[PDB]
Design an enzyme around this catalytic site. Sequence first.
Site, PDB file in Angstrom:
ATOM      1  N   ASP A 121       0.834  -1.175   0.000  1.00 55.53           N
ATOM      2  CA  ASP A 121       0.000   0.000   0.000  1.00 55.53           C
ATOM      3  C   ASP A 121       0.889   1.253   0.000  1.00 55.53           C
ATOM      4  N   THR A 159      -7.077   2.872  -2.417  1.00 50.07           N
ATOM      5  CA  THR A 159      -6.679   1.480  -2.183  1.00 50.07           C
ATOM      6  C   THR A 159      -7.637   0.476  -2.814  1.00 50.07           C
ATOM      7  N   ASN A 180     -12.972   5.008  -2.028  1.00 47.74           N
ATOM      8  CA  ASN A 180     -12.688   4.433  -0.646  1.00 47.74           C
ATOM      9  C   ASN A 180     -13.942   4.664   0.190  1.00 47.74           C
ATOM     10  N   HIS A 265       0.834   8.718   5.261  1.00 46.25           N
ATOM     11  CA  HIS A 265      -0.177   9.701   5.544  1.00 46.25           C
ATOM     12  C   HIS A 265       0.305  10.603   6.689  1.00 46.25           C
ATOM     13  N   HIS A 309      -0.931   2.507  -5.358  1.00 51.10           N
ATOM     14  CA  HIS A 309      -0.890   3.981  -5.627  1.00 51.10           C
ATOM     15  C   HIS A 309       0.349   4.513  -4.896  1.00 51.10           C
ATOM     16  N   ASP A 680     -20.494   9.485 -27.748  1.00 54.27           N
ATOM     17  CA  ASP A 680     -20.670   8.724 -26.521  1.00 54.27           C
ATOM     18  C   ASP A 680     -21.653   9.495 -25.631  1.00 54.27           C
ATOM     19  N   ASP A 684     -20.343   5.639 -21.695  1.00 54.05           N
ATOM     20  CA  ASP A 684     -19.944   4.257 -21.322  1.00 54.05           C
ATOM     21  C   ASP A 684     -18.568   3.858 -21.921  1.00 54.05           C
TER      22      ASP A 684
HETATM   23  C1  LIG Z   1     -14.465  -2.748 -19.591  1.00 50.32           C
HETATM   24  O1  LIG Z   1     -14.721  -4.142 -19.636  1.00 50.32           O
HETATM   25  C2  LIG Z   1     -16.001  -4.561 -19.252  1.00 50.32           C
HETATM   26  C3  LIG Z   1     -16.163  -6.079 -19.166  1.00 50.32           C
HETATM   27  O2  LIG Z   1     -16.042  -6.665 -20.474  1.00 50.32           O
HETATM   28  C4  LIG Z   1     -17.070  -3.957 -20.201  1.00 50.32           C
HETATM   29  O3  LIG Z   1     -18.258  -4.064 -19.427  1.00 50.32           O
HETATM   30  C5  LIG Z   1     -19.252  -4.910 -20.053  1.00 50.32           C
HETATM   31  O4  LIG Z   1     -19.925  -4.137 -21.008  1.00 50.32           O
HETATM   32  C6  LIG Z   1     -21.005  -4.761 -21.762  1.00 50.32           C
HETATM   33  C7  LIG Z   1     -21.785  -3.696 -22.683  1.00 50.32           C
HETATM   34  O5  LIG Z   1     -22.015  -2.419 -21.931  1.00 50.32           O
HETATM   35  C8  LIG Z   1     -22.011  -5.371 -20.743  1.00 50.32           C
HETATM   36  O6  LIG Z   1     -22.966  -6.208 -21.431  1.00 50.32           O
HETATM   37  C9  LIG Z   1     -24.317  -5.976 -20.909  1.00 50.32           C
HETATM   38  O7  LIG Z   1     -24.520  -6.757 -19.709  1.00 50.32           O
HETATM   39  C10 LIG Z   1     -25.837  -7.182 -19.296  1.00 50.32           C
HETATM   40  C11 LIG Z   1     -25.586  -8.420 -18.418  1.00 50.32           C
HETATM   41  O8  LIG Z   1     -25.276  -7.793 -17.174  1.00 50.32           O
HETATM   42  C12 LIG Z   1     -25.100  -8.631 -15.988  1.00 50.32           C
HETATM   43  O9  LIG Z   1     -24.347  -9.872 -16.110  1.00 50.32           O
HETATM   44  C13 LIG Z   1     -22.892  -9.830 -16.306  1.00 50.32           C
HETATM   45  C14 LIG Z   1     -22.242 -11.274 -16.528  1.00 50.32           C
HETATM   46  O10 LIG Z   1     -21.889 -12.154 -15.387  1.00 50.32           O
HETATM   47  C15 LIG Z   1     -22.334  -8.913 -15.172  1.00 50.32           C
HETATM   48  O11 LIG Z   1     -20.949  -8.611 -15.259  1.00 50.32           O
HETATM   49  C16 LIG Z   1     -22.992  -7.515 -15.111  1.00 50.32           C
HETATM   50  O12 LIG Z   1     -22.318  -6.719 -14.084  1.00 50.32           O
HETATM   51  C17 LIG Z   1     -22.674  -5.313 -13.936  1.00 50.32           C
HETATM   52  O13 LIG Z   1     -23.844  -5.045 -13.132  1.00 50.32           O
HETATM   53  C18 LIG Z   1     -23.693  -5.124 -11.681  1.00 50.32           C
HETATM   54  C19 LIG Z   1     -24.686  -4.118 -11.109  1.00 50.32           C
HETATM   55  O14 LIG Z   1     -25.960  -4.657 -11.383  1.00 50.32           O
HETATM   56  C20 LIG Z   1     -22.323  -4.776 -11.001  1.00 50.32           C
HETATM   57  O15 LIG Z   1     -22.152  -5.523  -9.769  1.00 50.32           O
HETATM   58  C21 LIG Z   1     -21.063  -4.899 -11.905  1.00 50.32           C
HETATM   59  O16 LIG Z   1     -19.956  -4.075 -11.366  1.00 50.32           O
HETATM   60  C22 LIG Z   1     -21.466  -4.511 -13.360  1.00 50.32           C
HETATM   61  O17 LIG Z   1     -21.771  -3.086 -13.302  1.00 50.32           O
HETATM   62  C23 LIG Z   1     -21.310  -2.418 -14.485  1.00 50.32           C
HETATM   63  O18 LIG Z   1     -22.031  -2.790 -15.701  1.00 50.32           O
HETATM   64  C24 LIG Z   1     -23.418  -2.350 -15.869  1.00 50.32           C
HETATM   65  C25 LIG Z   1     -24.029  -2.887 -17.215  1.00 50.32           C
HETATM   66  O19 LIG Z   1     -23.899  -4.353 -17.369  1.00 50.32           O
HETATM   67  C26 LIG Z   1     -23.413  -0.798 -15.691  1.00 50.32           C
HETATM   68  O20 LIG Z   1     -24.721  -0.245 -15.693  1.00 50.32           O
HETATM   69  C27 LIG Z   1     -22.748  -0.374 -14.364  1.00 50.32           C
HETATM   70  O21 LIG Z   1     -22.589   1.028 -14.224  1.00 50.32           O
HETATM   71  C28 LIG Z   1     -21.352  -0.937 -14.162  1.00 50.32           C
HETATM   72  O22 LIG Z   1     -20.463  -0.225 -15.009  1.00 50.32           O
HETATM   73  C29 LIG Z   1     -24.518  -7.661 -14.938  1.00 50.32           C
HETATM   74  O23 LIG Z   1     -24.801  -8.100 -13.607  1.00 50.32           O
HETATM   75  C30 LIG Z   1     -26.854  -7.454 -20.433  1.00 50.32           C
HETATM   76  O24 LIG Z   1     -28.152  -7.588 -19.816  1.00 50.32           O
HETATM   77  C31 LIG Z   1     -26.806  -6.365 -21.542  1.00 50.32           C
HETATM   78  O25 LIG Z   1     -27.703  -6.688 -22.648  1.00 50.32           O
HETATM   79  C32 LIG Z   1     -28.709  -5.666 -22.988  1.00 50.32           C
HETATM   80  O26 LIG Z   1     -28.079  -4.475 -23.520  1.00 50.32           O
HETATM   81  C33 LIG Z   1     -27.667  -4.493 -24.923  1.00 50.32           C
HETATM   82  C34 LIG Z   1     -27.779  -3.053 -25.469  1.00 50.32           C
HETATM   83  O27 LIG Z   1     -26.623  -2.257 -25.169  1.00 50.32           O
HETATM   84  C35 LIG Z   1     -28.416  -5.474 -25.892  1.00 50.32           C
HETATM   85  O28 LIG Z   1     -27.500  -6.033 -26.866  1.00 50.32           O
HETATM   86  C36 LIG Z   1     -29.148  -6.657 -25.233  1.00 50.32           C
HETATM   87  O29 LIG Z   1     -30.016  -7.277 -26.204  1.00 50.32           O
HETATM   88  C37 LIG Z   1     -29.848  -6.203 -23.938  1.00 50.32           C
HETATM   89  O30 LIG Z   1     -30.979  -5.294 -24.255  1.00 50.32           O
HETATM   90  C38 LIG Z   1     -32.027  -5.355 -23.230  1.00 50.32           C
HETATM   91  O31 LIG Z   1     -31.578  -4.778 -21.981  1.00 50.32           O
HETATM   92  C39 LIG Z   1     -31.407  -3.343 -21.978  1.00 50.32           C
HETATM   93  C40 LIG Z   1     -30.810  -2.902 -20.641  1.00 50.32           C
HETATM   94  O32 LIG Z   1     -31.460  -3.650 -19.594  1.00 50.32           O
HETATM   95  C41 LIG Z   1     -32.760  -2.687 -22.287  1.00 50.32           C
HETATM   96  O33 LIG Z   1     -32.661  -1.264 -22.298  1.00 50.32           O
HETATM   97  C42 LIG Z   1     -33.278  -3.169 -23.651  1.00 50.32           C
HETATM   98  O34 LIG Z   1     -34.433  -2.366 -24.077  1.00 50.32           O
HETATM   99  C43 LIG Z   1     -33.409  -4.723 -23.571  1.00 50.32           C
HETATM  100  O35 LIG Z   1     -34.346  -5.179 -22.552  1.00 50.32           O
HETATM  101  C44 LIG Z   1     -25.337  -6.238 -22.030  1.00 50.32           C
HETATM  102  O36 LIG Z   1     -24.824  -7.432 -22.625  1.00 50.32           O
HETATM  103  C45 LIG Z   1     -21.365  -6.147 -19.590  1.00 50.32           C
HETATM  104  O37 LIG Z   1     -22.307  -6.558 -18.568  1.00 50.32           O
HETATM  105  C46 LIG Z   1     -20.268  -5.279 -18.969  1.00 50.32           C
HETATM  106  N1  LIG Z   1     -19.588  -5.986 -17.905  1.00 50.32           N
HETATM  107  C47 LIG Z   1     -19.084  -5.397 -16.798  1.00 50.32           C
HETATM  108  C48 LIG Z   1     -18.334  -6.380 -15.892  1.00 50.32           C
HETATM  109  O38 LIG Z   1     -19.181  -4.213 -16.445  1.00 50.32           O
HETATM  110  C49 LIG Z   1     -16.818  -2.476 -20.408  1.00 50.32           C
HETATM  111  O39 LIG Z   1     -17.681  -2.109 -21.476  1.00 50.32           O
HETATM  112  C50 LIG Z   1     -15.324  -2.213 -20.713  1.00 50.32           C
HETATM  113  N2  LIG Z   1     -15.073  -0.790 -20.817  1.00 50.32           N
HETATM  114  C51 LIG Z   1     -14.513  -0.216 -21.893  1.00 50.32           C
HETATM  115  C52 LIG Z   1     -14.404   1.267 -21.764  1.00 50.32           C
HETATM  116  O40 LIG Z   1     -14.198  -0.884 -22.883  1.00 50.32           O
HETATM  117  C1  LIG Z   2      -6.551  -4.003   1.133  1.00 47.66           C
HETATM  118  N1  LIG Z   2      -6.571  -5.062   2.077  1.00 47.66           N
HETATM  119  C2  LIG Z   2      -6.908  -4.954   3.399  1.00 47.66           C
HETATM  120  C3  LIG Z   2      -7.431  -3.745   4.010  1.00 47.66           C
HETATM  121  O1  LIG Z   2      -7.698  -2.719   3.495  1.00 47.66           O
HETATM  122  N2  LIG Z   2      -7.716  -3.732   5.252  1.00 47.66           N
HETATM  123  C4  LIG Z   2      -8.192  -2.456   5.839  1.00 47.66           C
HETATM  124  C5  LIG Z   2      -9.742  -2.353   6.258  1.00 47.66           C
HETATM  125  O2  LIG Z   2      -9.277  -2.966   7.530  1.00 47.66           O
HETATM  126  C6  LIG Z   2      -7.841  -2.481   7.411  1.00 47.66           C
HETATM  127  C7  LIG Z   2      -6.703  -6.171   3.953  1.00 47.66           C
HETATM  128  N3  LIG Z   2      -6.204  -7.085   3.047  1.00 47.66           N
HETATM  129  C8  LIG Z   2      -6.115  -6.325   1.883  1.00 47.66           C
HETATM  130  C9  LIG Z   2      -5.595  -6.862   0.578  1.00 47.66           C
HETATM  131  O3  LIG Z   2      -6.680  -6.926  -0.396  1.00 47.66           O
HETATM  132  C10 LIG Z   2      -6.396  -7.239  -1.674  1.00 47.66           C
HETATM  133  C11 LIG Z   2      -5.125  -7.586  -1.994  1.00 47.66           C
HETATM  134  C12 LIG Z   2      -4.791  -7.912  -3.209  1.00 47.66           C
HETATM  135 CL1  LIG Z   2      -3.191  -8.341  -3.543  1.00 47.66          CL
HETATM  136  C13 LIG Z   2      -5.754  -7.858  -4.264  1.00 47.66           C
HETATM  137  C14 LIG Z   2      -5.526  -8.240  -5.666  1.00 47.66           C
HETATM  138  N4  LIG Z   2      -5.348  -8.528  -6.803  1.00 47.66           N
HETATM  139  C15 LIG Z   2      -7.010  -7.529  -3.919  1.00 47.66           C
HETATM  140  C16 LIG Z   2      -7.369  -7.168  -2.635  1.00 47.66           C
HETATM  141  C17 LIG Z   2      -8.716  -6.867  -2.285  1.00 47.66           C
HETATM  142  C18 LIG Z   2      -9.310  -8.057  -1.402  1.00 47.66           C
HETATM  143  C19 LIG Z   2      -8.856  -5.515  -1.481  1.00 47.66           C
HETATM  144  C20 LIG Z   2      -9.653  -6.824  -3.455  1.00 47.66           C
HETATM  145 CA   LIG Z   3      -3.728   2.220  -0.473  1.00 48.67          CA
HETATM  146 CA   LIG Z   4     -21.647   4.983 -25.772  1.00 50.57          CA
HETATM  147 ZN   LIG Z   5      -3.640   5.796   2.031  1.00 48.95          ZN
END
Ligand SMILES: *[C@@H]1O[C@H](CO)[C@@H](O[C@@H]2O[C@H](CO)[C@@H](O[C@@H]3O[C@H](CO[C@H]4O[C@H](CO)[C@@H](O)[C@H](O[C@H]5O[C@H](CO)[C@@H](O)[C@H](O)[C@@H]5O[C@H]5O[C@H](CO)[C@@H](O)[C@H](O)[C@@H]5O)[C@@H]4O)[C@@H](O)[C@H](O[C@H]4O[C@H](CO)[C@@H](O)[C@H](O)[C@@H]4O[C@H]4O[C@H](CO)[C@@H](O)[C@H](O)[C@@H]4O)[C@@H]3O)[C@H](O)[C@H]2NC(C)=O)[C@H](O)[C@H]1NC(C)=O
Ligand SMILES: Cn1c(C(=O)NC2COC2)cnc1COc1cc(Cl)c(C#N)cc1C(C)(C)C
Ligand SMILES: [Ca+2]
Ligand SMILES: [Ca+2]
Ligand SMILES: [Zn+2]
Length: 802
Positions: A121, A159, A180, A265, A309, A680, A684
């Site tokens: 860290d 972190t 954070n 810090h 960082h 865009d 996204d």
């Molecule tokens: C960086 O890399 C990442 C990873 O490759 C890229 O992100 C991917 O982008 C894809 C396109 O944007 C996206 O695909 C969509 O996903 C939907 C499935 O979603 C769920 O399942 C997956 C798989 O296990 C899961 O990862 C998803 O996780 C997100 O959601 C939860 C929160 O609920 C979070 O815990 C997690 O952090 C993650 O959040 C992020 O993503 C969402 C969007 O998925 C954002 O809103 C958040 O802010 C956050 O960034 C999900 O749990 C799937 O349903 C989609 O399909 C619909 O959309 C398209 C149209 O664009 C269409 O083709 C389909 O037919 C369908 O249409 C219908 O649904 C629409 C919306 O509901 C609706 O309006 C229509 O009218 C229709 O009903 C789509 O496939 C993929 O999920 C994400 N993955 C991740 C991990 O984020 C990212 O793009 C890259 N970045 C760059 C800059 O390149």
């Molecule tokens: C940060 N951290 C803490 C911590 O902050 N403790 C604070 C709150 O109480 C004191 C304890 N142990 C870790 C290491 O975590 C990681 C390490 C590695 Cl190497 C990777 C990867 N790749 C990912 C993580 C996660 C699990 C954060 C995602």
């Molecule tokens: Ca840190």
């Molecule tokens: Ca876009």
């Molecule tokens: Zn710090």
Amino acid sequence: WTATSGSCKGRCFELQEVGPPDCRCDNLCKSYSSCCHDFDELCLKTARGWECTKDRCGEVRNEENACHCSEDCLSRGDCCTNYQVVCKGESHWVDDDCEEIKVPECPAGFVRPPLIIFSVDGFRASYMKKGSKVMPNIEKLRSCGTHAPYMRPVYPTKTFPNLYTLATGLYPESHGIVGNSMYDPVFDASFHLRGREKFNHRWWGGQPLWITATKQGVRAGTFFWSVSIPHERRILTILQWLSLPDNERPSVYAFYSEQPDFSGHKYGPFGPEMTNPLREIDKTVGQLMDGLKQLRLHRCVNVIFVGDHGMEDVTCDRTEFLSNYLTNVDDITLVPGTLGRIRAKSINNSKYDPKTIIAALTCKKPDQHFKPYMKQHLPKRLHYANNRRIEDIHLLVDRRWHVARKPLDVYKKCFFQGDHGFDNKVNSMQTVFVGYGPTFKYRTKVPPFENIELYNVMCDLLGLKPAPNNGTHGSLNHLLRTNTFRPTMPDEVSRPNYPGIMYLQSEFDLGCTCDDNKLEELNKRLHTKGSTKERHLLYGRPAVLYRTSYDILYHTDFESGYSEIFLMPLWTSYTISKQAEVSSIPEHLTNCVRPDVRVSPGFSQNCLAYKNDKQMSYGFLFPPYLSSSPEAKYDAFLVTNMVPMYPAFKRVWAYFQRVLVKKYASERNGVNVISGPIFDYNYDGLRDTEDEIKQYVEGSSIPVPTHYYSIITSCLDFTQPADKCDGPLSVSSFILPHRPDNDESCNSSEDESKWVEELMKMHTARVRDIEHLTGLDFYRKTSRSYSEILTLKTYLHTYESE
Ligand SMILES: *[C@@H]1O[C@H](CO)[C@@H](O[C@@H]2O[C@H](CO)[C@@H](O[C@@H]3O[C@H](CO[C@H]4O[C@H](CO)[C@@H](O)[C@H](O[C@H]5O[C@H](CO)[C@@H](O)[C@H](O)[C@@H]5O[C@H]5O[C@H](CO)[C@@H](O)[C@H](O)[C@@H]5O)[C@@H]4O)[C@@H](O)[C@H](O[C@H]4O[C@H](CO)[C@@H](O)[C@H](O)[C@@H]4O[C@H]4O[C@H](CO)[C@@H](O)[C@H](O)[C@@H]4O)[C@@H]3O)[C@H](O)[C@H]2NC(C)=O)[C@H](O)[C@H]1NC(C)=O
Ligand SMILES: Cn1c(C(=O)NC2COC2)cnc1COc1cc(Cl)c(C#N)cc1C(C)(C)C
Ligand SMILES: [Ca+2]
Ligand SMILES: [Ca+2]
Ligand SMILES: [Zn+2]
Ligand SMILES: [K+]
Ligand code: NA
């Protein structure tokens, strides 16, 4: 509730959870108030400390000791790490010469070299040189392994965002850990470093390495370490896991150190008090490497020494207060410190105005140490917008400063002399990478790279197929001796049309006007068929990776890919030699726009729309200022070369085209330029489909870009001209926001020579960023390996000192 009076006997640091209510002996049990009554007694032994002494050599095993110096310890897997040194005349790993590891040298039963991620860290990049005298273990890893001069974290440079990025290969906007501290609005819930909320799985998106591993049959050690487990015990625990039987032993492990951040810090990044934390981390690396070496794993395991960082000098007196700007300061909630995020105290308030809050924070004091943004206007390189947890209003805070709501927030919490979380381009926020082991190269320096790239590499190191992520798989193959990922180029989805002359002038009714020998009649035919194209298109045509309709247009001075759907180029490519001349737009051609007889009226823009649209003007992608001849200049005024531009934005664009392109060509010995629009509207980071466009040129189907890009390539060996380069390339790129005001630039009322280039630097981009935003694939035809090109496409020009 737990029944916390089962026992940990035989189960210390067990690798699978047991479901409440049994009691727990895994690593998190403290954090969930859930350990068995005897956890500390059995599992956190401390008796006799952490080092064998001569008097303990061959002792009788005593199971109360923290570690053992008894003859049975190596087979029990629980010697003190210095056992062989003290009791068998062996050398510390650090005292041994560096010797190339050409192949893994593993004990029998090892299917693959284990990976140990050693995360530190707040380990700022310049500690590698500045603290070199007190970190011999770390310096040996670095000089004998593979290292970068520094590793670029993600924004915010905090972190949890950075370690969860390390584990997922995802931008925080995508993994969901966007600071954070956070507030999700569809959880009315607040995430903090203190407390138990952070442990709920709903915060943590994507697929971290330990899950990728588990799903594909590779076992993982813990990644989270409880704060009260001392480092010596974390190391012994890893070494014990490594002595497990083959069917039970993990292949991936992590060690985390709270230092040097914790001291940083308090004391600042280079406080006198920082020498000791560095000494201590070094000693812990020494313990691990001596432990590995006793278990005959020091030429088998791959070690990554990585930071999350850096650390900057920040004090209480360098704090900007929103109370000094706003009158309404009790109507907001600020997430404060080294970044700001603002939302409304109550969403039963239809009289809260983002616009008025932004205006009240914009250019309000002459040395103002933060800048407000709507998140969609933040530099696209930060990838910091597409998440409901990121407030619409953002403050980018200057390095060395803080932002706070009101003074009482700062003295009713000087405490602290260091902090981090600033823009990830800032030198003081850069952190470290070293890779050491059979799979990494020997004594190799690699260029700086982004931590988003490491998930793919760690998956490669473990034989895993990575989940979809934001790395560019292949871009880091040059770190590896073996286990490389053989990337291939994406297939082109849409093939271009090559239109000829198909329309007579009188078929066009665009409301445009322009004021307009046989030897050079064949000459210009040759130009419209692609005679100069080798010169202006140096790395092949970009591939279109989606379904669309577009035409290649050739001209003397530039080539373009013209979209029939968006009615403007997707890309425009041109080369400016060092010797090229800048010329003006003649008075008679000021308002000249010319129909293109290769493209139908119905797929052209029109001048009337721009006349009727009182906000919107137009510019050109190939600049008329860089025409090769008066005659060639007419080509720059084709309606096919025109793009919509706010007057305010035309000031930026014109300065770029009239002054800066020629500067770069003179400095870089020619440049190739590819320029184009980006759309865009849902922020996204990905190319919009046409049904996502929210703004058109009034009364038309001409869509308005959110940004304009340029990719500027030359020879890395600047003794060769851009257009005759035999070897590696050099690139810089930008994605400028297409804004109707220059409120971002506080000095914009001045001459463009004082602010424009500063703006463009802020909006520096990777080629890969432009790829995502356009669905184009660049550099398709070069003499370089594809891996090298992937590295080139990930490069960011940062414009920091060193
Ligand atoms: C960086 O890399 C990442 C990873 O490759 C890229 O992100 C991917 O982008 C894809 C396109 O944007 C996206 O695909 C969509 O996903 C939907 C499935 O979603 C769920 O399942 C997956 C798989 O296990 C899961 O990862 C998803 O996780 C997100 O959601 C939860 C929160 O609920 C979070 O815990 C997690 O952090 C993650 O959040 C992020 O993503 C969402 C969007 O998925 C954002 O809103 C958040 O802010 C956050 O960034 C999900 O749990 C799937 O349903 C989609 O399909 C619909 O959309 C398209 C149209 O664009 C269409 O083709 C389909 O037919 C369908 O249409 C219908 O649904 C629409 C919306 O509901 C609706 O309006 C229509 O009218 C229709 O009903 C789509 O496939 C993929 O999920 C994400 N993955 C991740 C991990 O984020 C990212 O793009 C890259 N970045 C760059 C800059 O390149
Ligand atoms: C940060 N951290 C803490 C911590 O902050 N403790 C604070 C709150 O109480 C004191 C304890 N142990 C870790 C290491 O975590 C990681 C390490 C590695 Cl190497 C990777 C990867 N790749 C990912 C993580 C996660 C699990 C954060 C995602
Ligand atoms: Ca840190
Ligand atoms: Ca876009
Ligand atoms: Zn710090
Ligand atoms: K206009
Ligand atoms: Na301004």
